[PDB]
Design a protein around this ligand. Sequence first.
Ligand SMILES: Cc1cc2nc3c(=O)[nH]c(=O)nc-3n(C[C@H](O)[C@H](O)[C@H](O)COP(=O)(O)O)c2cc1C
Ligand SMILES: Cc1cc2nc3c(=O)[nH]c(=O)nc-3n(C[C@H](O)[C@H](O)[C@H](O)COP(=O)(O)O)c2cc1C
Lengths: 401, 401
Amino acid sequence: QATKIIDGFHLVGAIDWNSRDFHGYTLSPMGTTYNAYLVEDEKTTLFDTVKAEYKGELLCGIASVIDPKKIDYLVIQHLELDHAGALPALIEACQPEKIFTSSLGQKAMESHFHYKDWPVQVVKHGETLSLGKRTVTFYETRMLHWPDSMVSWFADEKVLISNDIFGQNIAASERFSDQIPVHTLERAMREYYANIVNPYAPQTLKAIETLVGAGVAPEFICPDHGVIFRGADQCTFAVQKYVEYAEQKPTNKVVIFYDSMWHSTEKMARVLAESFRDEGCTVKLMWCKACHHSQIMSEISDAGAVIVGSPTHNNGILPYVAGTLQYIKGLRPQNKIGGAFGSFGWSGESTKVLAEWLTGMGFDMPATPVKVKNVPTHADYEQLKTMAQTIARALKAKLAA
Amino acid sequence: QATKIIDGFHLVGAIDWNSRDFHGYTLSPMGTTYNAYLVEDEKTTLFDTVKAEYKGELLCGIASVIDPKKIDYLVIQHLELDHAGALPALIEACQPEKIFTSSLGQKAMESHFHYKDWPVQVVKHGETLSLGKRTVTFYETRMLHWPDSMVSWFADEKVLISNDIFGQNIAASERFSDQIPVHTLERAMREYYANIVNPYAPQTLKAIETLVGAGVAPEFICPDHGVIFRGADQCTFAVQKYVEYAEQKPTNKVVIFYDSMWHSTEKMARVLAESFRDEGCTVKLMWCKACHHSQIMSEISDAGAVIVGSPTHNNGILPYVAGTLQYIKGLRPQNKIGGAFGSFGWSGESTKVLAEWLTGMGFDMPATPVKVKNVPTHADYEQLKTMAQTIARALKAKLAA
Ligand SMILES: Cc1cc2nc3c(=O)[nH]c(=O)nc-3n(C[C@H](O)[C@H](O)[C@H](O)COP(=O)(O)O)c2cc1C
Ligand SMILES: Cc1cc2nc3c(=O)[nH]c(=O)nc-3n(C[C@H](O)[C@H](O)[C@H](O)COP(=O)(O)O)c2cc1C
C-alpha cells in the first residue's frame, strides 16, 4: 500500500474518495487524501499523521515497509486533526522515542490532546536534525495556515514535506503531479489556496522567499493532501503558482453572485452579466442556491470584479448572500473592484448593506449601487448597463499596470 | 377543479405538491397551494390570482363554474407575484370592468406590472362594495406581510378572505381545516407565521384587534395558501393562534444551533443539550448543516432560549451560522434568552461575535459565553453545565409571570 517516492522515502496514508464536505468549511468535489511520510534511516521517522478514522490504513501502509515498532521519530508539522488525528494511535503502536513539533505546535498539541507524558520536543526555525545517514531541516511557516505550521527540508534529497502547503484536494489512483493533467492539478491547487490559505497571502510570500533565501529548490514537494509534486519543473510550477495566488492580481474576469425570491434581482444579474460581456470581460454568473460559497470563492480568487445582488428581505439581505459574504470577507480577497445591486419593495436596505460589506473588504466601488423598486424596467436596465461600464472601465484601467 | 365553499363561493387555483423551496426564503416541506376565490353575484368577482405558471389551472377551475369573460371584478389583495402573477392573463381572459386593490396595492401594482390602461380602482379601509345581492367590505392590514395587504369581509356570509394571513403551506386532497389533524394544521400555521409574519407581530395584534373591533367573526377564513378554515370554531382557532404566535411568550424550550468543523463546538453543544434537559428544559439541538434556517426559526418561535455555537473561522463565525442569524434577526423574535459558545485556535472572536448578534436582537444574556481553546476538557464541560444552569434559571423565573 505504501508508495515509494525515492530510496527510503514512502508515501503512506489514505485516499478519501468520498470526501465532499471538506472539514466543514469548503468543498472537495474530487475527494481528498491524507498523506504521511515514512523516512527510513538510523532513526526511522514518520512525518505527519492522518485523520483518526484512517489510523488503520496508515499503519497498514507503514507495516508494508517496516514494523511500526521500529519507528523512533514522530514529526508533527500541523496540529489540525486531519493531520494529527492518529497521533495517539501511532504513539501506542510505535512507542516513539521522540515526537517533534514546532514551538507553536506543542502548544496546540496540548490544547488538542491534553497529553499526560509524551516525549515531545520542540524544534526551532532552521534547526537541523540527524536521522542517521540523512538530516532533516525544519522551517517555520506560522499561519500557513495555522500558527503551528512548519515544513521539513531534506537538502540532499531535495525533498520538501509541506503539510497543508501546496496541498490540493484530489482523490485518485495517481499520486504524483506529473500523472495528472495540469489543468486539473492547477484548478485544484487554486481551489485549495483560495479557500484556506488566502487570508495569509503575505505570509505566503515571505515564507516562499525565505525558503528560497535558504537553498530550498525541491525535486519533491510532499503535501498533506493530494498528489506529490515530482520533478524540479513541477515543484517550480507549484511555487510560481503560490506566488501568483498570494499576489491576487486582477484579471478581466467578473464574478456576479446573487440570491432572489421573485427573480427581479435575477433579471438584473443576467443583464449585468451581458453588459460586462460586451465590455470584453469574462463573466461568471453564480446563484447562491446553486453554488457553494467555496465555489464562489474559487471563482473570485482570480477575478478583478465582484458584483453582489440581493433583494431586500426583512430589512437586510438574503441569508445565503450574507453567509457567502461572511465567508469571503474572512478569506480577505485583495485587489478587487466591487459592485452591488438589488430589488426592493419599500425599506430598500439591501444595496446599502451590500455596499458596506464590499467597502469593509477594501473593495473599490467606482459605481454606486443600482437599486430598483420591485420589477425592473428598460430604464433600470440602462442603469445596470451604466454600472457595468463604469466598473469595467476601472477594471480595464487597473489591468494596465 | 373548483371547490364549493358555500353557495356562490368557490375555491379555485392550484395545488403545488412539489414546492419545497418556497419563494426563495423558506421551506414548504408539505408543498403549498395557490388559492383564489370566485364569488357568484350580479357583479361576479374573483378574489386573488395565482402564481403565473398556474394561470391555466386557475382559468380551468373558474370556467368550471362560469365563463371567465363573465367575471366583472378582480380584487387584488396582495401584489406579491404568487398572488398577482396571473393578473395580466386574467385581465386578458376576463376583460374585467374593475380591478379592486388597496391604495398601497395600486402602488405596488405599478412597480410590478408597469401597466398602462388598467381599470384600477383603489378601495379604502372599511369601504364596502355592492356585488349585487352580496356586499363585501375591505379592511387594510398593512405589513401583514406587505404594505399593500388588505383582506375582504362578507359580513352576512361571515366569510373572511385573508390573502397570506392564516395561510399555511399544505398541499393536500383535503381543502378544509376540519379535514386535517390539528397538530398537522397547527404546526404548518406556526411554520408559516414564524418565517414571514413574525417581524410584524404588533401589526398582527392590532389588525386582529380592529377586525374584532368591527364585527369580524368568520365562519370561513379563506387564505392564499393551504386549507380553508371551515366553521366558527376553526376560525376562532386560527385567530387564537395568531394572537399566540404574535405574543411570543416564552416556554421551557431551548433551541441550540451551531456549526462546527472538527466537532469541538459540537461536543460543547451536546453537553449543553444534556444540562438543559437536566434543568427540566425541552431541547432542540440543531446543526446548521442539517437544518434549514427556516426550520431553526420554527423551533425558535416558541422557544424561551436560543443558544448559538460556532468555532472561530477566519476571525469570525462559520458562514451557515451567520446566514441563519441573519435570517433570524430579520424575523425579530421577541422575549428570548440568548446564549453563545464555541471553540477557537488563537484569535477567538466567535463568541464575541455571537454575543453581539444576540444582544443586537434584544436577547437577554444572563450568562457569559463559554469559549474553549480547541478541544474541550471536563473543566470546560463544567463551565457549560454552569452556563446551562444560569440560562435555565433565568428561563424559569420568566415563566412565572
Ligand atoms: C419574505 C419577504 C420579505 C420582504 N421584506 C422586505 C423588506 O424588509 N423591505 C423591502 O423593502 N421589501 C421587502 N420585500 C419585498 C422584496 O424586496 C421585493 O419583492 C423585491 O422586488 C423582491 O426581489 P426579487 O425578485 O429579486 O426576489 C420582501 C419580500 C418578501 C417576499
Ligand atoms: C479553516 C480554519 C480556519 C481557522 N480560523 C481560525 C481563526 O481565524 N481564529 C482562531 O482562533 N481559530 C481558527 N481556527 C481554529 C479553529 O477555531 C479550532 O480548530 C477550533 O477548535 C475549531 O472548533 P470546532 O471543532 O468546533 O470546529 C481555524 C481552523 C480552521 C480549520
